[PDB]
Amino acid sequence: QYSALRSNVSMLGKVLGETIKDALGEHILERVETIRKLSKSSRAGNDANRQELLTTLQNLSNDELLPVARAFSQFLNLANTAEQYHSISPKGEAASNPEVIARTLRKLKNQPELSEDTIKKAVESLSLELVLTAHPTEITRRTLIHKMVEVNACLKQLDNKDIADYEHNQLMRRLRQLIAQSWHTDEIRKLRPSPVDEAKWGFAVVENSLWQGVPNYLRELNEQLEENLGYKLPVEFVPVRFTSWMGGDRDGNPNVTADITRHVLLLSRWKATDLFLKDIQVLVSELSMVEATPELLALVGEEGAAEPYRYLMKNLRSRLMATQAWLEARLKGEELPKPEGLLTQNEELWEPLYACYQSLQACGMGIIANGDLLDTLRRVKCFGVPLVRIDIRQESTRHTEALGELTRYLGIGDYESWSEADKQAFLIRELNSKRPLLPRNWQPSAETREVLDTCQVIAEAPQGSIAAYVISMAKTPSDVLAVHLLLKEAGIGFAMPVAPLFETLDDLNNANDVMTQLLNIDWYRGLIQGKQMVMIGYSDSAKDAGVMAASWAQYQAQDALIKTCEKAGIELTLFHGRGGSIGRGGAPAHAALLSQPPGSLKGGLRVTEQGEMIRFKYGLPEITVSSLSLYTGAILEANLLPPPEPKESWRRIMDELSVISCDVYRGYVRENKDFVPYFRSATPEQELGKLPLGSRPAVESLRAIPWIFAWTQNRLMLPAWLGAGTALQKVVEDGKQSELEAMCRDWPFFSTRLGMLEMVFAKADLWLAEYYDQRLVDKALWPLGKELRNLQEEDIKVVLAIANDSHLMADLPWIAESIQLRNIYTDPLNVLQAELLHRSRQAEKEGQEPDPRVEQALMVTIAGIAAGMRNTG
Amino acid sequence: QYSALRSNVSMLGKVLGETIKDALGEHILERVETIRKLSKSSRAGNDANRQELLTTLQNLSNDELLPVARAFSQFLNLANTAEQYHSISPKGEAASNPEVIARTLRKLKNQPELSEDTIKKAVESLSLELVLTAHPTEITRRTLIHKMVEVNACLKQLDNKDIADYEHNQLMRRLRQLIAQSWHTDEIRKLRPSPVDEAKWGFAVVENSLWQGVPNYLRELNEQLEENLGYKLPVEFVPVRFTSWMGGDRDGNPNVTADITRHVLLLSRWKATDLFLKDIQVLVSELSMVEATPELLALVGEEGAAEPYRYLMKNLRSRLMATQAWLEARLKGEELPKPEGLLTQNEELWEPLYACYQSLQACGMGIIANGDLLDTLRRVKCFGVPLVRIDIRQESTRHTEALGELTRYLGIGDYESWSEADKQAFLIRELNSKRPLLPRNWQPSAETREVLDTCQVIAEAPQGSIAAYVISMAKTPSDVLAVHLLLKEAGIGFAMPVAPLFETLDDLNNANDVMTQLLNIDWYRGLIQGKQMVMIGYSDSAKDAGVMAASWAQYQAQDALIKTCEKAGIELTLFHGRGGSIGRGGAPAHAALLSQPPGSLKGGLRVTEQGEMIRFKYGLPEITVSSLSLYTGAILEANLLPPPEPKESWRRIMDELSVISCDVYRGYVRENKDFVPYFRSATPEQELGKLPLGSRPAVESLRAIPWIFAWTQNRLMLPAWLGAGTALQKVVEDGKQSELEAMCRDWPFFSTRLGMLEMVFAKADLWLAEYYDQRLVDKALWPLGKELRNLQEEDIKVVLAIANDSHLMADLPWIAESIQLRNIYTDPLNVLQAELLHRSRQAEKEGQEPDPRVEQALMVTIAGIAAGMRNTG
Ligand SMILES: N[C@@H](CC(=O)O)C(=O)O
Ligand SMILES: N[C@@H](CC(=O)O)C(=O)O
Ligand SMILES: [Mn+2]
Ligand SMILES: [Mn+2]
């Protein structure tokens, strides 16, 4: 079964080892082989080999550090590519086999009490919007997407049995070339990337995978609809849209200025012109058809009425080339009027393209119409003019300060002192006011000016470039009303979707109250035009209260909001954030989406795909088809077959669990006096902040990402499990274990919550965790480490006991197996990383010079460990 | 065995039939199915179905003609692509399996009396130069190369056994798209192509196949050298070069003016810039290596000494972009000074590229150096700056007139009246003269000015753009001396290779005499710098005297020339022309090259690849590797293992054969009074002249091409067999059959000559031939037709008797089989073509209007028949 995968990893590793021998050494290969041996030994109890391991690492010269690190990082890299190849190959788990869609559609179709029209309308109302996010540990300076597409193509071809030995030889020769490139093509950011750089990586994902991936997803989905149900969605219906937060999210990031966003907004347009030209060229040459309709001929009428379809593609070609030229100037900083055929809306690309499609169908050229034209048609609506719409995100606090400084300058009062009823009073008065408020030539502070300039970019940008304004830390109705006032002042002609982001236990708790007041304001209700979009901050609430309380809190807030909006007639859209069980990808994800309160996906799927998981969910075009197909079935099933409502006793088990768990979690994280000092020593948290990892500049202070990432590198995974098990053991100790087991079998929310601990417990590593304490933590803090490690050992038993199994995550053997592989490949990077942190941390203590070798090897481990661990939050 | 091929043709035909049903009809499919049935019946003797066939064709409306024709043309097209796919697939004849090289190298290596150094120097002196020629029946307006690469890729992928049904489904969906494109993408020249258009098709061959093909050929050849012999050729040795006659050959073509050549010369440079940029971009991003040599660092020294290889690739990128810009202006007709980094020589691309290679090897990055850099390195020397050097070609007569008009204007005398000793006298005097001769502001006639302007282009063009000046119809030493005088007058700074083209039996006969006089002129001998290049006009001499006399005449002239130049110390290079057994491609070709007089390829292989055979020899990159590999073994074997010298009695059998055969051939073609009238009626010769087939404007008059092509369409193949058999039967009738059989077993020249008749007799078709007489020829000319057809029936027996076989070409079963397939697919185009010629020819007789439908269907048959028949001369 996993034999083929085991063979490929072994094959790619020999090739790497070959390349390293050629490269520079047999010595480094020995540096690598001694470290694995010693590490395996040490773990298996040999305390003499632990000594040996410690001396071996300490004797590594600084010149050996990076090459050794990169080696370990590379072996892991081939392991993941062997892992991902296996996943889409038909003689392996086969993630992109269209049965994934059909299995879901068959289930529905033969489910009594499910009218076919009920099914058809759910189909016709599908909607997915995937919001790309930056990768927090992207270490190189150029995107590697395209090389990966290539290694994968080579593995695909070597899979053909009966391949003539010469073909085999040829394939292996390129494979060695491609691996060598990676060992020698070293790039390492020296400096913190910038929002433009991160915006650029998203364009790389779009062109190396989404560009082909989306249209294929749409063809397969369509072939399946018609096969299983008897009808194809209409050409005009493209249910997928991609959006990006890159150069749009300034929450906590001073480097994302209104100037940067302006810039990135332009760049996207430039890149869409680039990709759309490649599509249009193809079309200009293949559309030599001369048979056309009255309507189409009319549309050209003479001049090009002797090459009709070609005509309309040539016109578009110029129109695209003109706008390209204009944006390359603006990118450059030059201002010059815009050409007559400047492209700003998708309708401008759609229209002509759709006209050709229509005649070709009408005139008997169906097959040609449904080929590359169809693909460009779907890409216009999926990507269009802006390529990827961006989302703007700023904290609520920042809006309050801007509007406070404004009010004091006008002598009206001080907004950040007024009670909430006064703020709404002031906001509704001004929102209805016809006289401006923003002083024409004002002198605000840097911060305020930024808030003000950003809304001017939004307002200045063509409609459909910006998908939504997200308000992180939204706590009251004035928080939402505040951005509508600023946008009004910025001059905006359309209705911009504003979304509160509730990301704390109380804000989640108060969320429903906050929106019912907002919908009771008649002015607000008519401004949103029957649609609201809320954002649920799972990851931050879990930082606040622990994962159990956060999950139940989020469960309750969505159910309350779904019901509130339904009473009020508003189409609610839940915007999902980062991690959680909805961001696990694959089957768990599909289980997860279905485990949400009934109603939850009635207004669509909108999620924040984590940066570090992009390669694994959209890395190759076939993975994109898998990912979109999985999501698509989930929506459909969740909307026609919602989960049951919880048995009241369950609710009381969850209330309690939530209190015990939050109580234990805060016990340690907030109340325990040794925790912060422990944390800072045991995890590479401080270094993740100094090093040039994300574009943000170098426990309540911290952000979800750095909280999660730091514990992931240490291997304890504290954030993702902490009070859950403790609370669960206690409830069992009351004899309620039988109810916990019923909740698991019959309540999707609950099994899915327990499922997720299993995977975290599956990647955590207590031997490694203990090793960092031994090397990095002061002796007096060891007891706390031992305590937290023992908490986990006990939490795995309760979880295994409730799950009635003896092996963790036994329902997902392929995920289990793949986690087993990466764990062994990741092993040596954690062993090495501890030495680097030690060398690094002692240089500082003794006012030394950040050695560049030591720092770069550390960035390699960080990024390798993060890649081997994937999702851990 | 041929099962897989039979399956694929059936598969592609169903898909075509599917597409046509969708398209416009079930009626046309019936138009096609009735015509094959009736045609098969008629042939098999049913004279009632022959009547039915005749009425069926006559009842076709003019609106049915083209679609019916195109259908038959398309089925043939899929048949050839199934045929060509099978040829390179490892589970079929496998043309590009590197054993082709190794088999040859093994043979050599273990051949006693063959020192390994003798072998190594032959290796180090290999040299191939393939001169591309236009396609005489290219009917569409855009090159289809690239689509064909794609259909082939799709067949390759469907060959994988174990292909998951979804993959299979996906592949078939594109296949249907691709076929549909061809049925609906109709383009048909309305007008005669132009030299630029034909120059453009050669660029299409270069980029869709030679660009990848050459470097692969070079890697395989290199891997084989080292495997079998123990050494690899050095990086600086690229033994292949491609040249084109497109926009260079004006022999007989008024449309190829000096202006056109100037233009085409520029365009090639533009296109090389285009392809070289794609290579350089790749290099600019993959060469991130920072480890470099003193020498390389020196070469950059600071500025870019922190990204050395990238630096040199970025410099070249600008340099290429600059020259591109300059040629797009010149192409446009604008004159503006040339940029500082204008590229004119290959050394300018070589140099930097080679520097990177050197450091990468030196610094341990061998594997990266030997990858894409190696490929660009080899392409520079194979294609370089000009992309494809062109060759200029003008008749000798035209030079005599230009120089006659010149002399009369100066009052010196009249060159075209002076005896040959006087012409040489005058020419040597002026060639040594320091005072000019060409009047500064003269008024010649159009013709003369063209001769004069063309030499000015040659002279004006950068050195290495023009490979040689070919003199068609060269008869005496003054013919060669004449072009050296004109070139001198045109101002030329380098030594341009001039080559006489002997293309008549007497000129072949006199060839040796002509060159010994030329080498006895001390002035000439020192001007050519130890190198002469002669051109052998097989195809035209055969038009003159028939194929046997021509072949023996050519055999004798090369042997005489090889010997003459060897005595004189000149490196002779035989330039081969069109068709003949050297242009058969594949194994016959390899046999053919080896059957030439010893010495023959000592100065390399230079051949004129026929236009209509390009798809079949260089159509896909893998076919190019096959073709170059076959040629390469032939050179090596021919140079280390020459054929035996003929037994004197053989020579006398050949003299006689040559006289009898020429005698019979001229009997019919020149002396017979009914022949011309017959010819013009039975073949589409006149129409091939009117229709927009080649770029030349709309029996001694005629040219090889039109002589051959016309008889190929009729199916009799007269030009390629005519007196051969007649002469052979006569010699058997003297009891010398036993000597003819010995000559065949032991004399390569002879078996190869008889081999070639077999293939012509294999594609000829006497039933079809008779059908054209019945439909197109007047009753009184029928007897001549019957006579010529009966000549052939008798010639096949003598040939089969001498070959001791009962089935034609029994030593080449795959070629035999593939000829069988195409013959059945071509069948209906000949049946249809006869009706078109009838309708066309009667419209004219009755002063009607060339109906465009009738003419376009005719162009389709012409081009289809020419494609099914491939090489027939
Ligand atoms: N994404 C997997 C874990 C992994 O593949 O590393 C899960 O959510 O369970
Ligand atoms: N090129 C083949 C004939 C063919 O393939 O049609 C030969 O020279 O014998
Ligand atoms: Mn937050
Ligand atoms: Mn000629």
3-state secondary structure A294-314: HHHHHCCCCCCCCCHHHHHHH
| Distance of alpha carbon A390 from alpha carbon B825, whole angstroms | 58
Q: Based on the domain organization, do A222 and A256 belong to the same domain?
A: yes
Ligand 2 mutation pick, B819, B822, B823, max ligand atoms within 8 A of CB: B819
> How close B212 comes to chain A (CA, Å)?
14
Return all residues near B488 (Cβ < 8 A) that are at least 6 apart.
B430, B431
- Are both A121 and A85 inside the same structural domain? no
| SS3 category, B500 | strand
- Closest-CA distance, A289 to chain B, in angstroms, reads 6
Of A615, A647, A679, which residue constitutes the final position of a domain? A647
CA closest to B91 among chain A residues: A164
Q: Are residues A204 and A186 in the same domain?
A: no
Q: Are both A217 and A335 inside the same structural domain?
A: yes
Say whether both A561 and A605 belong to one domain: yes
B560 Cα to chain A: minimum distance (Å): 43
Query: Would you state the structure tokens that stand for residue A504, as one six-digit string?
Result: 């704390």
Residues 6+ apart with CB under 8 A from B319: B341, B343, B348
A30, A109: one domain: no
How far, in Å, is the centroid of ligand 4 from the Cα of B501? 8
A180 contacts B367? CB cut-off 8 A: yes
Distance, CA of A478 to CA of A333 (rounded, Å):
38
Largest Cα–Cα distance in chain B?
89
CA distance B463 to A15: 46
User: Is residue A106 classed as helix, strand or coil in its secondary structure?
Assistant: helix
Q: What share of chain A is helix, strand, coil (3-state, %, to 5)?
A: 65, 5, 30
DSSP per-residue letters across A388-440: SEEEEEEEHHHHHHHHHHHHHHHTS--GGGS-HHHHHHHHHHHHH-SS--S-T
User: Which 8-state DSSP code applies to residue A469?
Assistant: E
> Do residues A223 and A99 make contact, with C-beta atoms less than 8 angstroms apart?
no
CB B191 within 8 A of CB B852: no
Angle at B237 between CA B230 and CA A182, to 5 degrees: 75
Partner residues linked to A500 by β-bridges: A471
Nearest to B458 by CA among B493, B502, B505: B493
The last residues before gaps in chain A (C-N over 2.5 Å) are 698
Minimal CA–CA distance to B586: which of B549, B623, B611? B623
The Cα B809–Cα A395 span in angstroms is 85
User: If contacts are CB pairs under 8 Å, which of residues 147-166 in chain B contact chain A?
Assistant: 160-164, 166
Q: Are residues A247 and A279 in the same domain?
A: yes
Helix, strand, coil percentages (3-state) for chain B, rounded to 5, are: 65, 5, 30
A681 touches chain B (CB under 8 A): no
Q: Are residues A562 and A661 in the same domain?
A: no
Residues A591, A680: one domain? no
Tell me how crowded residue B531 is: count the other CB atoms within 10 A of its CB: 13
Atom of ligand 2 nearest to the CA of B581: 8
Å between B227 CA and nearest CA of chain A = 13
Q: Which of left, alpha, beta for B577 (phi over 0: left; psi -120 to 50: alpha)?
A: beta
A-contacting residues of B 276-305, CB under 8 Å?
A: 285-286, 288-289
B463 and chain A in contact, CB less than 8 A: no
| Residue in chain A lying closest to B24 (CA) | A364
Residue of A174, A176, A181, A187 best to disrupt the B interface, most CBs of B under 10 A: A181
Kindly calculate the radius of gyration of chain A based on its CA atoms and give it in whole angstroms: 28
Give CA–CA dist A690/A73, Å, rounded.
21
Contacts of residue B779, defined as CB under 8 A and 6 or more positions apart, other chains included, come to: none
What backbone phi and psi angles, to 5 degrees, belong to B345?
A: -125, 155
Q: Which of A66, A166, A175, A361 to mutate to test the interface with B (most CBs of B within 10 A)?
A: A166
Note the Cα B409 to chain centre separation in Å: 41
Q: Which of A296, A135, A126, A143 is nearest to A218 (CA)?
A: A126
d(CA A257, CA A449): 10
Give the number of other Cβ atoms within 10 Å of residue A725's Cβ: 25
Residue A24, classed as helix, strand or coil, is: coil
Are B587 and B728 in a shared domain? no
d(CA B606, CA B600): 11
Give backbone dihedrals phi and psi of B361, rounded to 5 degrees, phi first: -60, -50
Give the nearest ligand 1 atom to A581 CA: 8
- The secondary structure element, H or E, covering residue B466 is strand B466-472
Q: Which tokens sit at B99?
A: 């054993």
- Give Dmax (Cα) for chain A: 89
Instruction: Inform me whether the C-beta atom of residue B185 falls under 8 Å from chain A C-beta atoms.
Output: yes
Residue with structure tokens 């989905």?
A221
Please indicate whether, in this complex, the C-beta atoms of A367 and B166 are within 8 angstroms of each other. Answer: no
- Experimental technique used to determine this entry: X-ray
**Reduced to 3 states, what is the DSSP secondary structure of residue A267?**
helix
The 3-state secondary structure of B672-729 reads CCCHHHHHHHHCCHHHHHHCCCCCCCCCCCCCHHHHHHHHHHHCCCHHHCCCHHHHHH
- B793: exposed, middle or buried (C-beta count within 10 Å: 0-12, 13-18, 19+)? exposed
Report the residue numbers after which chain B has a gap, meaning the C atom sits over 2.5 angstroms from the next written residue's N, or none: 698
Tell me how crowded residue B653 is: count the other CB atoms within 10 A of its CB. 24
Q: A859 and A817 share a domain?
A: yes
- Closest ligand to B819 CA? 2
Reading the block at residue B366, the tokens are: 């061998």
Q: What total number of domains does chain B contain? A: 2
> CA A393 to CA A441: how far, in whole Å?
26
Residues of A with active-site annotation: 135, 543
A239 near A127, Cβ under 8 Å?
yes
Q: Report yes or no: A525 and A531 within 8 Å, Cβ to Cβ.
A: no
| Pocket residue to mutate for ligand 1, from A618, A623, A759, most atoms within 8 A of Cβ | A759
Domain limit, last residue, from B622, B647, B672:
B647
List residues near ligand 2 (CB under 6 A). B 584-585, 588, 759, 815, 818-819, 870-871
- The C-alpha atoms of residue A229 and residue B865 are separated, in whole angstroms, by 48
Q: Distance between CA atoms of B161 and B157, rounded to whole angstroms? A: 9
CB of A852 less than 8 A from some CB of B: no
Whose structure tokens read 């704390």? A504
The ligand whose atoms approach the alpha carbon of A702 most closely is 3
Q: Do B289 and A24 touch (CB under 8 A)?
A: no
Same domain membership, residue A569 and residue A517:
yes
CB pairs under 8 A between A and B: 80
Residue of A613, A869, A870, A872 best suited for mutating to test ligand 1, as the one with most atoms within 8 Å of CB: A870
| 8 Å CB contact between B92 and B86 | yes
Contact assessment for residue B338 and residue B346, using Cβ atoms and an 8 Å cutoff: no
Nearest-angstrom CA–CA distance, B643 and B641? 7
From ligand 3's centre to the CA of A178, what distance in Å? Answer: 41
Q: Which long-range contacts (CB under 8 A, 24 or more apart) does A511-514 make?
A: A511/A557, A511/A560, A511/A561, A512/A557, A512/A560, A512/A561, A512/A564, A514/A474, A514/A475, A514/A476, A514/A477
Q: How far apart are CA A215 and CA A235, in angstroms?
A: 12
Place of tokens 């090289």: B101
Per DSSP (E only), the strands in A109-191 are: 128-132
Q: Please list the alpha-helical segments (H only) found in B229-307.
A: 258-286, 294-298
Whose Cα sits closest to atom 7 in ligand 1?
Answer: A584
Listed residue (A394, A391, A417) closest to A404, CA to CA: A417
With b for 16 or more beta-carbon neighbours within 10 A and e for fewer, the A556-589 pattern comes to bbbbbbbebbeeeebebbbbbbbbbbbbbbbbbb
Interchain proximity A289–B185, CB inside 8 Å: yes
Domain with A163, as residue range(s), is: 1-95+135-191+648-873
A364 touches chain B (CB under 8 A): yes
Torsion sign across C-alpha atoms A32, A38, A42, A47: negative
Burial of A439 (0-12, 13-18, 19+ CB in 10 A): exposed
Residue A29, both tokens: 């290969």
Domain boundary residue among B607, B629, B647?
B647
B637, B640, B644, B645: CA torsion to nearest 10: 120
SS (H, E, C) A321-365: HHHHHHHHHHHHCCCCCCCCCCCCCHHHHHHHHHHHHHHHHHCCC
Cβ–Cβ contact B22 with A under 8 A: yes
Q: Identify whether the C-beta of residue A853 lies closer than 8 Å to the C-beta of residue A62.
A: yes
Residues A656, A661: Cα–Cα separation, whole Å: 8
In sequence order, what are the beta bridge partners of A241? Answer: A129
- Tell which residue, B361, B430, B181, has the closest CA to residue A289: B181
Q: Which amino acid is present at A92?
A: G
- Provide the 3-class DSSP secondary structure of residue B330: helix
User: Which residues between 69 and 98 in chain B have a beta carbon less than 8 angstroms from any beta carbon of chain A?
Assistant: 90-91, 94, 96-98
Q: Give how far Cα A436 sits from Cα of A401, A431, A459, A482, A485, Å.
A: 19, 10, 16, 15, 11
